[PDB]
Amino acid sequence: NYGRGRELMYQLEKKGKEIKRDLEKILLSGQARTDVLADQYLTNSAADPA
Amino acid sequence: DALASVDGNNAHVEGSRAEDGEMKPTVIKSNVTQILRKVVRVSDTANTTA
């Protein structure tokens, strides 16, 4: 290709930037910490992981 | 922890897909402490003689 080398190294670099953009958008979003555990981190099931 | 059961009759094919297998987590055992206490009340009136 004229303005690049291999179609893999070029795409990887593009993804390395998109991950940062989505990261910033996520860190500044309003997501409510969607997780299977809601205040159950230290309040999870007993010794038996039911 | 405890190793999984023998799980006999586990015959397989020479060439085939490696199934996901199976695992088992650990078990947590906890205990609590107990308080032991003694008391000694002695008056100087009694702790005066020999």
Place this chain on the structure above:
Amino acid sequence: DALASVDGNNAHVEGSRAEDGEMKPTVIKSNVTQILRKVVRVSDTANTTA
């Protein structure tokens, strides 16, 4: 190819001809191997925790 059963009546005449043949098989004992497999799949995230 163990020996044959003892013939307690192995009595013959002095001027008798031999009897019929003694065609016996060549019985073979055989077995087959068994494939034992143990698969374990653990996420990479779980491999980073302490």
